[PDB]
Design an enzyme around this catalytic site. Structure first.
Site, short mmCIF file in Angstrom:
data_model
loop_
_atom_site.label_atom_id
_atom_site.label_comp_id
_atom_site.label_asym_id
_atom_site.label_seq_id
_atom_site.Cartn_x
_atom_site.Cartn_y
_atom_site.Cartn_z
N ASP A 217 68.58 112.92 5.71
CA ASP A 217 68.49 111.47 5.44
C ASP A 217 68.65 110.68 6.74
O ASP A 217 69.77 110.48 7.20
CB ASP A 217 69.56 111.02 4.46
N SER B 64 56.62 97.88 13.93
CA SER B 64 55.19 98.22 13.77
C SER B 64 54.31 97.07 14.22
O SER B 64 54.69 95.90 14.03
CB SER B 64 54.92 98.57 12.32
#
Length: 330
Positions: A35, A199
Site C-alpha cells: 500500500d 500530472s
C-alpha cells in the site's frame, strides 16, 4: 541486495493485489496488501480478538525466535474508506521475494474493523508511503523500504501490476525487459507523506490533450482512478448511457459498451489506460450495468491514481534523498 515477488489480484475484479511476505524465524508466510498510500506494517496476529479473525492467516510472535516486543509502543490507523485497526509492536525478520530486513517493525493487530474481518484474502498491509505517516508511538517506525534502503543495489522498487493477472513487485533494481520505450521521471512532493506528483494533463479517446495540472498520489492500495469532477464528466460524456447513480455511488454504464481509452500525462510523456481497464465489472452478477473505473475525487479531497491507472504502467518509485516517480508504457 535485491528482492522480487509475484503480486496477485484477490478477485476477478482486480480489487486489490496481495503479495506473500515472510515473517519471523522460522518464516511465517502471510499475504499482504502492499500500500503505497500508507506506512504501517500491520498483520492479523495471535493477539487479534478471536471473533474478529475470519479465515485470515496470523503471525504468532511467540513462534518466532527472532521476534521482540517493542516495549510501550502502540499504534492505531484508519484508512480513507473508514476501516481501522490498532495494537502493539514487535520487531522481527521480514523477507519479501528474497530480500530480508532485520528488526522490521511488525505491527500486531489486537483489534480489526469489520471490513478487514470480511476480507479473507488479506492478512494485513505493508505500507510504502513515507515514514512520516507511520502510526507507531511514541516513536515512529521505518517502512520495509526505508529499512532495506542501505542494502539495496539501488534505492528503488517498481510496481508492475497485472490486468486480471499476477505481476511483480521488485526491490532494488529496474527490470528493463518489463516495459517498452523509456521511463519518464517526475518530481515528488513529500509534504503530505504521500507519493504525490503533478500530472501534466489528460486526453479522452482519440481527442485532444488538455494541459491542466492534476495533483495526485500514486496509491497501490486504492482500487480505482479518482480525478477532478470536470475531468470525469469529460470522460463519461463519450459513453452514451453512462450516467452517475446515487444508489451505486458513482458513474455506471452498460456492460455492452466499448469504453474509450484515457490518457494522462507525465511531463512530456503520455500513458494510456485502455478502455477495457475502465470497465470495472457488473454492479451485481448478471446485471447489464457495470461500475465505472474512473470516478470523482471530489468527496475524497485528493486525486488518486490507484490500480486502474498504475496497472497500465510500469511504475518506478525512486527513493533517493530526492524521491522521483517514473512511469513507462508496458
Amino acid at each position: 541486495s535485491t528482492g522480487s515477488a509475484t503480486t496477485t489480484p484477490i478477485d476477478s475484479l482486480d480489487d486489490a493485489y496481495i503479495t506473500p511476505v515472510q515473517i519471523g524465524t522460522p518464516a511465517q508466510t502471510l499475504n499482504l496488501d502492499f500500500d503505497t498510500g500508507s506506512s504501517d506494517l500491520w498483520v492479523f496476529s495471535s493477539e487479534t480478538t478471536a471473533s474478529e479473525v475470519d479465515g485470515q492467516t496470523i503471525y504468532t510472535p511467540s513462534k518466532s525466535t527472532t521476534a521482540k516486543l517493542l516495549s510501550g509502543a502502540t499504534w492505531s490507523i484508519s484508512y480513507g474508506d473508514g476501516s481501522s485497526s490498532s495494537g502493539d509492536v514487535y520487531t522481527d525478520t521480514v523477507s519479501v521475494g528474497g530480500l530480508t530486513v532485520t528488526g522490521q517493525a511488525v505491527e500486531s493487530a489486537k483489534k480489526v474493523s469489520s471490513s478487514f474481518t470480511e476480507d479473507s484474502t488479506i492478512d494485513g498491509l505493508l505500507g510504502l508511503a513515507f515514514s512520516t505517516l507511520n502510526t507507531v508511538s511514541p516513536t515512529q517506525q521505518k517502512t520495509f523500504f526505508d529499512n532495506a534502503k542501505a542494502s539495496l543495489d539501488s534505492p528503488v522498487f517498481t510496481a508492475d501490476l497485472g490486468y486480471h493477472a499476477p505481476g511483480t513487485y521488485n526491490f532494488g533494481f529496474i527490470d528493463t525487459t518489463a516495459y517498452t520505450g523509456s521511463i519518464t521521471y517526475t518530481a515528488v512532493s513529500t509534504k503530505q507523506g504521500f507519493w504525490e506528483w503533478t500530472s501534466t494533463g489528460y486526453a479522452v479517446g482519440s481527442g485532444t490533450f488538455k494541459s491542466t495540472s492534476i495533483d495526485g498520489i500514486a496509491d497501490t492500495g486504492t482500487t480505482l482512478l479518482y480525478l477532478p469532477a470536470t475531468v470525469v464528466s469529460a470522460y463519461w460524456a463519450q459513453v452514451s448511457g453512462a450516467k452517475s447513480s446515487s444508489s451505486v455511488g458513482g458513474y455506471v454504464f452498460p456492460c455492452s459498451a466499448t469504453l474509450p481509452s484515457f490518457t494522462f500525462g507525465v511531463g512530456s510523456a503520455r500513458i494510456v489506460i485502455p478502455g477495457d481497464y475502465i470497465d470495472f465489472g457488473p454492479i451485481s452478477t448478471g446485471s447489464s450495468s457495470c461500475f465505472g473505473g474512473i470516478q470523482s475525487s471530489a468527496g475524497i479531497g485528493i486525486n488518486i491514481f490507484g490500480d486502474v491507472a498504475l496497472k497500465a504502467a510500469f511504475v518506478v518509485f525512486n527513493g533517493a534523498t530526492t524521491p522521483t516517480l517514473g512511469f513507462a508504457s508496458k
